[PDB]
Ligand binder design. Structure first.
Ligand SMILES: CCCC(=O)N[C@@H](CO)C(=O)N[C@@H](CC(C)C)C(=O)C(CO)CO
Ligand SMILES: [Mg+2]
Lengths: 243, 244, 231, 241, 240, 249, 241, 212
């Protein structure tokens, strides 16, 4: 029958490793770098666009940063289409939680739901996993500001600062060097921009090659996706470009 | 590359489905079976290889009937032939239920052909290991058809399949060439007995039992009946006289 | 050999190797013989034992008061097939108040077995069945193979070394065909036939099973001391 | 739809997918469980890459199945999440239908049955997870410690470890656990557990989790400072022997 | 080889997965059964993998019903599904018929479940466990059945399964007679277990149980088994 | 039966999704098609490569309307594109117009077709689509937009781009010829000039297909009497208009 | 390897099964052509009856799909009849659901969509047939639309299919370059049948008897197939040309 | 029907009648309305005869399965809840049953649970179910006290079922008596009303509404 063509995507290697999970992580390793930093009063997400050209529109472009609800956002590294599938499911689950409990979904619950969705593909169904890694930046009343990551294995972890995609080792070393616990959100913006500029593969770091977002505080939490002009302003403000 | 013949419904670089051709190989290794369309009907005949004398004679019937007017004989995997005949019986039943009239021979042929051809579209199923000679009398007269494991079927003045298919075919052609006006029903019965006896020579090591049925507009009133009794013995004697 | 992976693959010769391997599973099974006259039909079964502490496995299965079978091969597949045959006889009796003809039972088994030789996933049944029955047409004996081919015979044998009993019945045909109205002589002929298929054994009370069906005799199975008179 | 038999037999009588799941368990964090006279202690190893990791929000290795029964694991953490969810749902269902919380053995048998089912179903791979389930049966002060493997086997243990370098910890436990005298005090049991972890944990504390289980739904996870106290006691007594 | 189906015949006429599962059963703990006229006896090697393992939690002999017990050997995790099926079969037969289920019928139901594998959903592989089903009913008295993942089952006066089954079968064949008593059967089971065991046989790594028409199916506690072991030692010491 | 219930697109050890790369390869061998966004409209163009001169070119329409304000062109395997445009037209109604009464924005329809393609790269027993699409649309709150959708399901917004054989050369041309002050007529002119390099044979209205998303066409509405019903912005250029704009190069 | 057996992409972006189905279309060694008249559409095909045991009247590759649509198939007769039955079903369902006769091009698009499905889903093999639909559509006039195993479909001013396809194609191209129109400027369908037979005899270089041809004519609100006697009339009238 | 069960110092007393009626027709006078689920578990029957008999036999099957799986006697709470969830699955379908699960376990002591086809499940010390529950309730409540002797409690249950059998037309036949102690249940005989009435009238001096 068809059993000869079945690649068996949900089997174990003799070492106890999932072939497809490892290969999808290797795939994500070539994706644009994304960084999340959790300050004491905010969270910062930054990412570099792998797709670059003079003719690419940036105003209407959303490739790496996505809104899940009004208090949680994601930085994406990997297959953007699998990412959009998972983001749609996550938005639906957040709105389900809202309809059921009349409260915004706690960040870890949403992250765990999305990680369970990811893990399902690695145990049954005989389908390929999602070639996407996520950095979730969120806020809830129970734990405050939260930063999580999720890889195709379905495993998820919580971080003060973290990076996914290309040059994760260099970015993680730089963050471990320059991260302090009591820092504010603006210092985190500066640190994220510095790490992206030091780990980029391009000549210089411009506004057109990166996406930026901040979840900060009026007693309320505001989620800001940075526009190209705001990105250019913050770049010239942190001393990475001039005018 | 290679491996094109390992799965069904796989096109080879020359555009062939090797599994169907292997099914045809399975067909050719079967016993001889023929059909002769005469002036007002059709006659079907088959050789039954009597492997031992422990076989109860006149039992173990091979000729099958669909509805009351269709006769079917097949060479190859006997169980695949029975399966195909069961499907054809379901088709004829549904056709009668919806349209009241018994299913015409071309309509029934297309039912069988679509079924067999569908069995060559997927790797999850094996093609039919039979070739089938069938037919009968409808409102448009007598019809004889032969259907291949590929799903290909055609209308024939005469048809033959199995081991002795070559000799049989030749004999059939002689008939078509000698009297183009046609044979009568009983004449066709005796001639089918002759052709089965002649085609048995390719299996002359083991003894055989002749089996003949017919569907004639005048001799059987359009119904399918086994040729038995005095007429069967008459055909057997005609065959004995024609071989010697 | 790349053509023996499943039942949906024809070999270039036109063969179905999984069906052939099921037949070979039969040939490794214990010997059982069946024969019939014009009024009766007998199954004799040499049931095999795993060892001397083992039980000689049940080898004859009743399907209805007028029909039964003996098996050679994979006992589970014979259980499945015998249950199907029981259900078909039961359906005949319930819906039509009609004892199922033995020929029709053979046809139904043929179709049930053929369904497994053409579909991916699953296998042909690894059993051969000898089916005896008395119906409105008299006595009947049928041989059933996993290929689906069912054939009506006066006598036959299946299992290991079955050719001895086969040739014995081929020679004794005109003798046992005329044992009408004397079940003991028919059973003795069947036991001599099954004895012709022994190499380093001899029939005893533990390894013998007999089954009889006939004109005024419903399908009955004799096991143990009941068969001692035929040894 | 997808029902292909992934876990099948090999000619030597092995189900390679289950053994590879055991392999995945062998590369997971170490987990140890020790039965006291009136408590069960579960210790767990954290990885040393905790640089920048947020310990407040990161999932802990010891998950509470019910007020009286807790579960730790070794292997793939996502499979563990699936198993833990199934176990918690079954515990609430047992409360609902029997009007009595699950026994540690019943919960263990349910988890092991799920794992076994996964080695027998088509289209699915086994769990790369082995579990230690600890607690006290309702209205009982006898400790219970059970272990389940990806194959579906489960068994009771006076003390047991699974995961990476668990053979060293197992040798230490076989040497230093007396059936005649189990650790009487909670302190003695926690001390034995942190010693068992330190045999393989080359970082010391902060890379050690400890959860104590006492009867009648008393469950407490030790803070890093209490673990540091125990570790300093172990280091002081290390020179003695 | 994954390049074939689970329901695939070998050229010799055997099911690959069935034979391989039998090979897996050969690797399991030893389980021996002896059927007498005073009852049936089932013994198993517990086989602890570490001194820390509490040997009491090794349930390799289970109760199907008050008159039917079971001993498992091989991948004992696979046994659970069969044990629940058999317990449900016995209780359901008692519900439908107000009587105890015949031992052969219970074994047949288990084996009907056994070959329900392949690729309308079934299990993917055969069981990796073999069963000794001991019981008593009024029709055939005391019975001991051996149930394989092949769907086939046999009846035995005595039968040994698992690791070291060959020599155990030989010993049983030599030492079994029809007039064997229950205690004699217990001692013989303990003897063969001690012979094929890789450790010194004691009450902690060997479990004994029996089925009597009077008292049903009872698993011997540690003390009775220890006394039987001491009595076997005394019996063996009184030989020349 | 359908035994193909498993993914036919898996990760290689290098991390590549082989079938997606091979579908992109199949796209690269497709006829050149380009799109250019202006300030008052968008233009999409392609070459009408007919195999036989006996074939009628008008039936082989490579530019397809999706909504009255959104059109599409492709490079790759024609039939995949045809079934994709059918699915897109259907989903524009089922998932949006029947819910909100208005046609969907360009980005949302693009994401729906991207979801279809991503399903094709992950569902059981199916190959990815062998096409890349250029979707040119206009909505009230985003203005004019031009998106490119790949077999992987990835989509990106372009000021101007090209796909197919002459993709690299055409894109270089567009990069050195495009500015944010461009007009719809200037964009049509640049599109014609860019196609002139990617078409070696005859270059007339009969051999090229060109369409625009510009202003609303009340004459193409079919009815009058609803002041809010402005008309369709998608308009396919006729061969005569193409010739009139070619004669003045 | 296996990318040559199912409809998936080769590293060169090719579907080898589709190409091999295209190859299978020429298995019957029969050529056919289709031409458009003033108000009709003619299809001629070769009629090869090799066996003397065959009923020639049942040997056909032209199908009456609807009362207005005719279909000639280049390929094996099992796949031909499969596609023909599917087309008849689709045309009847169209007339029922939408209240007007299915247009030729719409049926072509339907069959082409099914072919595309076969080339994208792996469980179903492509049909090794090339389908030529002819009609006199109420909105388009004489129409010829062709569909191939690849899922491609297109209309033609005239067309030809088979092994000697290119020769007939060249002849027709030359005639239409000379004639400067896209059809046959003849009023009667008999004259268009004559034209088609003449140009096939010229392109193939072989004469035809009445038993060597199959002629299907589509006129307004009718599609029929000529008998051997009607074809003999056409040939006899050709003799004077 | 009239069934009653009450717990006191000495354990549990269970007392039922034995009459089954199909309308005004007395279908039977010898119906066993106590199911002996196990040596420590009894179940009373009141309502549809088929419903009660069938579902309590099924409950006994479920309790046997529980013993086989958990190697432990099922609790009274668990058995009552099994039956309760079963009948609630059929709520509205037309099941008519009113049962009392009475038992002793080492965990919860002696326990009486009332279950009905409505899905109601109640734990209690005294219960009377059936068409004649009010009649038995009168006598039982008027003569109940916790510190009753086993003899006195047996006689109180017998007398309450007798009073119900007297006044209620649909109750009668024979009183079936059971005593549940820590060691399990003990049957205390089938007492025909046709003689017990006159015996109690003579010895007790009650039933002065009757001629005799
Ligand atoms: C012939 C069968 C017809 C039947 O089922 N009658 C029922 C209800 O009319 C019935 O006999 N119920 C008894 C209970 C016993 C029989 C278990 C009862 O509960 C009281 C009234 O509640 C007696 O009337
Ligand atoms: Mg295909």
């Amino acid at each position: 029958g068809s059993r000869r063509y079945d690649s068996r995507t949900t089997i174990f290697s003799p070492e106890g490793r999932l072939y497809q999970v490892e290969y999808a992580l290797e795939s994500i390793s070539h994706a644009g770098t994304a960084i999340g930093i959790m300050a004491s009063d905010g969270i910062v997400l930054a990412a570099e666009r792998k797709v670059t050209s003079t003719l690419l529109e940036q105003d209407t472009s959303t490739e790496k940063l996505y809104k899940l609800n009004d208090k949680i956002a994601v930085a994406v590294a990997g297959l953007t289409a699998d990412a959009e599938i998972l983001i749609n499911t996550a938005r639906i689950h957040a709105q389900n939680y809202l309809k059921t409990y009349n409260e915004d979904i706690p960040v870890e619950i949403l992250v765990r739901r999305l990680s369970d969705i990811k893990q399902g593909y690695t145990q049954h169904g005989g389908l390929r996993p999602f070639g996407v890694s996520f950095i979730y930046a969120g806020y809830d009343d129970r734990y405050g500001y939260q930063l999580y990551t999720s890889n195709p294995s379905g495993n998820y972890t919580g971080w003060k600062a973290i990076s996914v995609g290309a040059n994760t080792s260099a970015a993680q070393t730089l963050l471990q060097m320059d991260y302090k616990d009591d820092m504010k959100v603006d210092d985190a913006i500066e640190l994220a921009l510095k790490t992206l500029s030091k780990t980029t593969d391009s000549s210089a770091l411009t506004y057109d090659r990166l996406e930026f977002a901040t979840i900060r505080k009026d007693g309320e939490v505001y989620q800001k996706i940075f526009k190209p002009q705001e990105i250019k302003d913050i770049l010239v403000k942190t001393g990475i470009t001039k005018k | 590359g290679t491996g094109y013949d390992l799965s069904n419904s796989v096109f080879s670089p020359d555009g062939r489905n090797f599994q169907v051709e292997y099914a045809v190989k399975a067909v050719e290794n079967g016993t001889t079976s023929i059909g002769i369309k005469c002036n007002d009907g059709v006659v079907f005949a088959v050789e039954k290889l009597i492997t031992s004398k422990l076989l109860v004679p006149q039992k173990n019937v091979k000729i099958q009937v669909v509805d009351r007017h269709i006769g079917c004989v097949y060479s190859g995997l006997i169980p695949d032939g029975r399966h195909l005949v069961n499907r054809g019986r379901e088709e004829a039943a549904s056709f009668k239920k919806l349209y009241k009239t018994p299913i015409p021979i071309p309509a029934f042929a297309d039912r069988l052909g679509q079924y067999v051809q569908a069995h060559t579209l997927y790797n999850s199923v094996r093609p039919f290991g039979v070739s089938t000679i069938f037919g009968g009398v409808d409102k448009n007269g007598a019809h004889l058809y032969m259907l291949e494991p590929s799903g290909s079927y055609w209308g024939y003045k005469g048809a033959a399949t199995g081991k002795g298919r070559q000799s049989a075919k030749a004999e059939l052609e002689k008939l078509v060439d000698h009297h183009p006006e046609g044979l009568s029903a009983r004449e066709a019965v005796k001639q089918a007995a002759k052709i089965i006896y002649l085609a048995h020579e390719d299996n002359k090591e083991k003894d055989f039992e002749l089996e003949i049925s017919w569907c004639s507009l005048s001799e059987t009133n359009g119904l399918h009946k086994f040729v038995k009794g005095d007429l069967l013995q008459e055909a057997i004697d005609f065959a004995q006289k024609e071989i010697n | 050999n790349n053509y023996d992976g499943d039942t949906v693959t024809f070999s270039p010769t036109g063969r179905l190797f999984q069906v052939e391997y099921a037949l070979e599973a039969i040939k490794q099974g214990s010997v059982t013989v069946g024969l019939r006259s014009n009024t009766h039909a007998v199954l004799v079964a040499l049931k095999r034992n795993a060892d001397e502490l083992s039980s000689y496995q049940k080898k004859i299965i009743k399907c209805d008061e007028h029909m039964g079978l003996s098996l050679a091969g994979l006992a589970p597949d014979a259980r499945v097939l015998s249950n199907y045959l029981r259900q078909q006889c039961n359906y005949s009796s319930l819906v039509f108040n009609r004892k199922l003809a033995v020929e029709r039972a053979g046809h139904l088994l043929c179709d049930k077995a053929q369904k497994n030789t053409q579909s991916y996933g699953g296998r042909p049944y690894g059993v051969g069945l000898l089916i005896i029955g008395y119906d409105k047409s008299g006595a009947h004996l049928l041989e059933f193979q996993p290929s689906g081919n069912v054939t009506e015979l006066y006598g036959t044998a299946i299992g290991a070394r079955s050719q001895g009993a086969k040739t014995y019945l081929e020679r004794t045909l005109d003798t046992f065909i005329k044992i009408d109205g004397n079940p003991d002589e028919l059973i003795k002929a069947g036991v001599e036939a099954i004895s012709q298929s022994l190499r380093d054994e001899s029939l005893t009370v533990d390894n013998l099973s007999i089954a009889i069906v006939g004109k005024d005799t419903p399908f009955t199975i004799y096991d143990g001391e009941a068969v001692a008179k035929y040894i | 739809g997808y029902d292909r038999a992934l876990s099948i037999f090999s000619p030597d009588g092995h189900i390679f997918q289950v053994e590879y799941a055991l392999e995945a368990v062998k590369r997971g964090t170490c987990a140890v469980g020790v039965k006291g006279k009136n408590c069960v202690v579960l210790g767990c190893e954290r990885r040393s890459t905790l640089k920048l990791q947020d310990t407040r929000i990161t999932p802990s290795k010891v998950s509470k199945i019910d007020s009286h029964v807790v579960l730790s694991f070794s292997g793939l953490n996502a499979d563990s999440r699936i198993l833990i969810e199934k176990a918690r749902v079954e515990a609430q269902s047992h409360r609902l239908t029997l009007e009595d919380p699950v026994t540690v053995e019943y919960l263990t048998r349910y988890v092991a049955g799920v794992q076994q089912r996964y080695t027998q179903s088509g289209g699915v791979r086994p769990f790369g997870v082995s579990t230690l389930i600890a607690g006290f049966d309702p209205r009982d002060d006898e400790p219970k410690l059970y272990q389940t493997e990806p194959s579906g086997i489960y068994s009771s243990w006076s003390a047991q470890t699974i995961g990476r370098n668990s053979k060293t910890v197992r040798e230490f436990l076989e040497k230093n656990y007396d059936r005649k005298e189990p650790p009487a005090t909670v302190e003695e049991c926690v001390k034995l557990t942190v010693r068992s972890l330190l045999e393989v944990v080359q970082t010391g504390a902060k890379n050690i989790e400890i959860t104590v289980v006492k009867p009648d739904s008393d469950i407490v996870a030790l803070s890093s400072e209490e673990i540091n106290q125990y570790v300093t006691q172990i280091e002081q007594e290390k020179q003695e022997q | 080889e994954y390049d074939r189906g689970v329901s695939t015949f070998s050229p010799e006429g055997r099911l690959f997965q069935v034979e391989y599962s039998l090979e897996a059963i050969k690797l399991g703990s030893t389980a021996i059964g002896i059927a007498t006229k005073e009852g049936v006896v089932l013994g198993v090697e517990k086989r602890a993998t570490s001194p820390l393992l509490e040997s009491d939690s090794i349930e390799k002999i289970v109760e199907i019903d008050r008159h039917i017990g079971c001993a498992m050997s091989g991948l004992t995790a696979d046994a659970r599904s069969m044990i629940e099926h058999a317990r449900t079969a016995a209780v359901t037969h008692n519900l439908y018929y107000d009587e105890d289920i015949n031992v052969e019928s219970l074994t047949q139901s288990v084996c009907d479940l056994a070959l329900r594998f392949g690729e309308e959903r079934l299990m993917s592989r055969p069981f990796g466990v073999a069963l000794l089903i001991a019981g008593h009913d009024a029709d055939d008295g005391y019975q001991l059945f051996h149930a394989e993942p092949s769907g086939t089952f046999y009846r035995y006066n005595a039968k040994a399964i698992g690791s070291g089954s060959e020599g155990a079968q030989a010993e049983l064949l030599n030492e079994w007679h029809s007039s064997l008593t229950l205690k004699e059967a217990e001692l013989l089971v303990l003897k063969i277990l001690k012979q094929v065991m890789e450790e010194k046989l004691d009450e902690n790594n060997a479990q004994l149980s029996c089925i009597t028409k009077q008292d049903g199916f009872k698993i011997y506690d540690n003390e009775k088994t220890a006394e039987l072991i001491k009595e076997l030692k005394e019996k063996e010491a009184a030989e020349s | 039966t359908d035994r193909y219930s498993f993914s036919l697109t898996t990760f290689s050890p290098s991390g590549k999704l082989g079938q997606i790369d091979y579908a992109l390869t199949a796209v690269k061998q497709g006829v050149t098609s380009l799109g250019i966004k202006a300030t008052n409209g968008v233009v999409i163009a392609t070459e009408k490569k007919s195999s036989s001169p006996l074939a009628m070119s008008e039936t082989l329409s490579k530019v397809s309307l999706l909504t009255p304000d959104i059109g599409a062109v492709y490079s790759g395997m024609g039939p995949d594109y045809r079934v994709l445009v059918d699915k897109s037209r259907k989903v524009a109604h089922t998932s949006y117009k029947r819910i909100y009464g208005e046609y969907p924005p360009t980005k949302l329809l693009v994401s729906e077709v991207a979801k279809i393609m991503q399903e094709a790269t992950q569902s059981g027993g199916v190959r990815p689509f062998g096409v890349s699409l250029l979707i040119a649309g206009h909505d009230e709150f985003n203005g004019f937009s031009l998106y490119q959708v790949d077999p992987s399901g990835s989509y990106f917004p372009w000021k101007a781009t090209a796909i197919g054989k002459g993709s690299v050369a055409a894109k270089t041309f567009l990069e050195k010829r495009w500015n944010d002050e461009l007009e719809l007529e200037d964009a049509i002119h640049i599109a014609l000039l860019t196609l002139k390099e990617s078409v070696e044979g005859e270059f007339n209205g009969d051999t090229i297909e060109l369409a625009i998303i510009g202003d609303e066409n009340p004459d193409l509405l079919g009815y009058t009497g609803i002041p809010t019903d402005k008309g369709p912005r998608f308009r396919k250029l006729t061969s005569q208009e193409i010739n009139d704009r070619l004669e003045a190069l | 390897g296996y990318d040559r057996h199912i409809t998936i992409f080769s590293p060169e972006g090719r579907l080898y099964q589709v190409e091999y189905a295209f190859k299978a279309t020429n298995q019957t060694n029969i050529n056919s052509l289709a031409v458009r008249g003033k108000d009709c559409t003619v299809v001629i095909s070769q009629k090869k009856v090799p066996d003397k045991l065959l009923d020639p009247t049942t040997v056909s590759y032209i199908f009456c799909i609807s009362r207005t649509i005719g279909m000639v198939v280049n390929g094996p007769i099992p796949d031909a009849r499969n596609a023909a039955l599917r087309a008849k079903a689709e045309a009847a369902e169209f007339r029922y659901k939408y209240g007007y006769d299915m247009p030729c091009d719409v049926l072509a698009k339907r069959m082409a969509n099914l072919s595309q499905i076969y080339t994208q889903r792996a469980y179903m093999r492509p049909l090794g047939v090339i389908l030529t639909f002819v009609s006199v559509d109420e909105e388009l006039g004489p129409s010829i639309y062709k569909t191939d195993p690849a899922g491609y479909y297109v209309g033609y001013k005239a067309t030809a299919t088979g092994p000697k396809q290119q020769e007939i194609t060249t002849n027709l191209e030359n005639h239409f370059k000379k004639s400067k129109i896209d059809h046959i400027n003849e009023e009667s369908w008999e004259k268009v049948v004559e034209f088609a037979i003449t140009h096939m005899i010229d392109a193939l270089g072989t004469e035809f008897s009445k038993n060597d041809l199959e002629v299907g004519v589509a006129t307004k609100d009718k599609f029929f197939t000529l008998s051997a006697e009607n074809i003999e009339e056409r040939l006899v009238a050709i003799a004077e040309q | 029907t009239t069934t009653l069960a009450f717990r006191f110092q000495g354990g549990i007393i269970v007392a039922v009648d034995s009459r089954a009626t199909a309308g005004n027709w007395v279908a039977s006078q010898t119906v066993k309305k106590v199911i002996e689920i196990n040596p420590f578990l009894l179940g009373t029957m009141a309502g549809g005869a088929a419903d009660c008999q069938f579902w309590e036999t099924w409950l006994g099957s479920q309790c046997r399965l529980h013993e086989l799986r958990e190697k432990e006697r099922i609790s009274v709470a668990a058995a009552s809840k099994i039956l309760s969830n079963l009948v609630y699955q059929y709520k509205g379908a037309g099941l008519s049953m009113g049962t009392m699960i009475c038992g002793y376990t080492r965990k919860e002591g002696p326990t009486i649970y009332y279950v009905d086809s409505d899905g109601t499940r109640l734990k209690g010390d005294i219960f009377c179910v059936g068409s004649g529950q009010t009649f038995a309730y009168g006598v039982l409540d008027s003569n109940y006290k916790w510190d009753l002797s086993v003899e006195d409690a047996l006689y109180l249950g017998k007398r309450s079922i007798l009073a119900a059998a007297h006044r209620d037309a649909y109750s009668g036949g024979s009183v079936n008596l059971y005593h549940v102690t820590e060691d399990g249940w003990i049957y205390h005989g089938n007492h025909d009303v046709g003689e017990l009435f006159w015996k109690v009238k003579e010895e007790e001096g009650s039933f002065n509404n009757v001629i005799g």
